[PDB]
Amino acid sequence: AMDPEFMDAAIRQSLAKLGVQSTEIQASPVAGMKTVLTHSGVLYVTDDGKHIIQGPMYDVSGAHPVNVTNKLLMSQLNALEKEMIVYKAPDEKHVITVFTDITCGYCHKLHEEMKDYNALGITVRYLAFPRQGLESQAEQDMKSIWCAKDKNKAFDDAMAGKGVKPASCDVNIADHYALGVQLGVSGTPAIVLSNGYVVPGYQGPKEMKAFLDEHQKQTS
Amino acid sequence: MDAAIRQSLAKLGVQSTEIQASPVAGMKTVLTHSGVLYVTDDGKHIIQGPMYDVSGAHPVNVTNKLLMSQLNALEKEMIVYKAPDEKHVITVFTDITCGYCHKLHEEMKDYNALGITVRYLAFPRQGLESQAEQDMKSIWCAKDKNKAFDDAMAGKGVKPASCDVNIADHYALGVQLGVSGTPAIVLSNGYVVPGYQGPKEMKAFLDEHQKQTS
Ligand SMILES: [Mg+2]
Numbered sequence: 413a414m415d416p417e418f419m420d421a422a423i424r425q426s427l428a429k430l431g432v433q434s435t436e437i438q439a440s441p442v443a444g445m446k447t448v449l450t451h452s453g454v455l456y457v458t459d460d461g462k463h464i465i466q467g468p469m470y471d472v473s474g475a476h477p478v479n480v481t482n483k484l485l486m487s488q489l490n491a492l493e494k495e496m497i498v499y500k501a502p503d504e505k506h507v508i509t510v511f512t513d514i515t516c517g518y519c520h521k522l523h524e525e526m527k528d529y530n531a532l533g534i535t536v537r538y539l540a541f542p543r544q545g546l547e548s549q550a551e552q553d554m555k556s557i558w559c560a561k562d563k564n565k566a567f568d569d570a571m572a573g574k575g576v577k578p579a580s581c582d583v584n585i586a587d588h589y590a591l592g593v594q595l596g597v598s599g600t601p602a603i604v605l606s607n608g609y610v611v612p613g614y615q616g617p618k619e620m621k622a623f624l625d626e627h628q629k630q631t632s
Numbered sequence: 633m634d635a636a637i638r639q640s641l642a643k644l645g646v647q648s649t650e651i652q653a654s655p656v657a658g659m660k661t662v663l664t665h666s667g668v669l670y671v672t673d674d675g676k677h678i679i680q681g682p683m684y685d686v687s688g689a690h691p692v693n694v695t696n697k698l699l700m701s702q703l704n705a706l707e708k709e710m711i712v713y714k715a716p717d718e719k720h721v722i723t724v725f726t727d728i729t730c731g732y733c734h735k736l737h738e739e740m741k742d743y744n745a746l747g748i749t750v751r752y753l754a755f756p757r758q759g760l761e762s763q764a765e766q767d768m769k770s771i772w773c774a775k776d777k778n779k780a781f782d783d784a785m786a787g788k789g790v791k792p793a794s795c796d797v798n799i800a801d802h803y804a805l806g807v808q809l810g811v812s813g814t815p816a817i818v819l820s821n822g823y824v825v826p827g828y829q830g831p832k833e834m835k836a837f838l839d840e841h842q843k844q845t846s
Pocket residue numbers: 439440441442443444445446
């Protein structure tokens with residue numbers, strides 16, 4: 413608190429040379445490296461800022477590798493819960509957070525199946541991840557959806573093909589996009605599980621439920 | 633010994649061929665058949681390479697810089713086409729069934745004429761035991777390797793041969809360097825330029841790179 417942070421200052425200064433001007437520096441479990449969040453991804457940086465390596469980092473001590481970068485990011489993820497468009501399941505067995513795009517093919521398929529996911533005990537929470545870019549057709553539309561009085565109704569309507577009624581908001585979609593990139597999201601839909609594990613591509617309700625049951629059993 | 637690292641890797645089905653120091657205290661550079669992993673001494677944490685030194689004016693990929701030792705150790709099984717007045721040396725992962733590899737090769741004199749020496753290693757895109765692998769094994773086992781390579785590239789067939797070369801060694805090093813296709817051009821500090829590049833473009837990039845890395 414009254415403790416100076418010379419070394420984190422070296423990290424910021426180093427990244428600045430690389431054009432990376434906005435950073436969030438936290439601890440990493442690897443001795444001599446810090447976790448460094450940027451808009452373009454997570455970087456592991458030595459304390460002195462001289463060596464950099466792209467995330468993610470794995471803990472392989474247990475029976476399966478866990479992505480500790482994503483486990484760490486679950487804190488940032490869960491802290492956007494009031495901006496998530498949530499479809500809760502009656503007796504929740506599992507919660508997933510999906511990065512979605514209203515022009516995304518399998519995002520349409522997934523949303524169509526929302527009832528089936530919910531029937532299986534799976535709650536789905538959406539964050540926005542527009543392919544086209546951080547300033548484009550989908551990105552602006554999704555800002556309007558996210559700022560609606562009833563996000564569920566708005567989202568359902570766009571996905572149904574009814575178009576989107578505009579609105580303006582505190583929410584910056586760019587926050588969702590950066591979290592996604594940090595998590596390693598390389599396209600939509602991107603399904604993020606409770607410990608930050610990002611599922612490879614789309615899984616429908618039956619397969620997802622099966623996978624969630626095992627993921628839960630084999631993660632602490 | 634690095635027992636903990638090796639134990640961790642074995643749990644994952646990974647085969648280490650070399651474990652050595654890294655710029656990070658308590659973390660090792662681990663060379664595998666699928667790439668370079670950075671692994672803590674205690675066997676617990678892993679980050680996939682490469683690592684970058686960002687202290688100088690320009691970032692350097694230190695993983696590939698380190699790998700240049702492995703690369704240069706293989707100098708005697710490279711097929712070398714030296715430039716009369718050598719100003720740069722590049723190493724090229726090639727495949728005799730790769731279209732741009734023939735384009736690159738047929739311009740060998742023009743690269744040489746600009747002062748660029750080209751050294752080949754084999755990278756059979758279709759993996760080991762493939763026909764490309766076999767033909768290139770035989771090529772690399774010829775007594776006149778340049779004669780054999782030119783002739784295969786010119787369509788005059790490949791004389792069968794056996795020797796100490798194990799193409800898998802070339803392939804693995806390529807994968808470690810980050811080679812994901814042929815031809816792949818490797819500069820004196822391990823920097824990889826993917827795909828064919830013409831003589832003039834290559835000469836320009838080499839001059840820029842040399843200025844940046846001195
Ligand atoms: Mg640390």
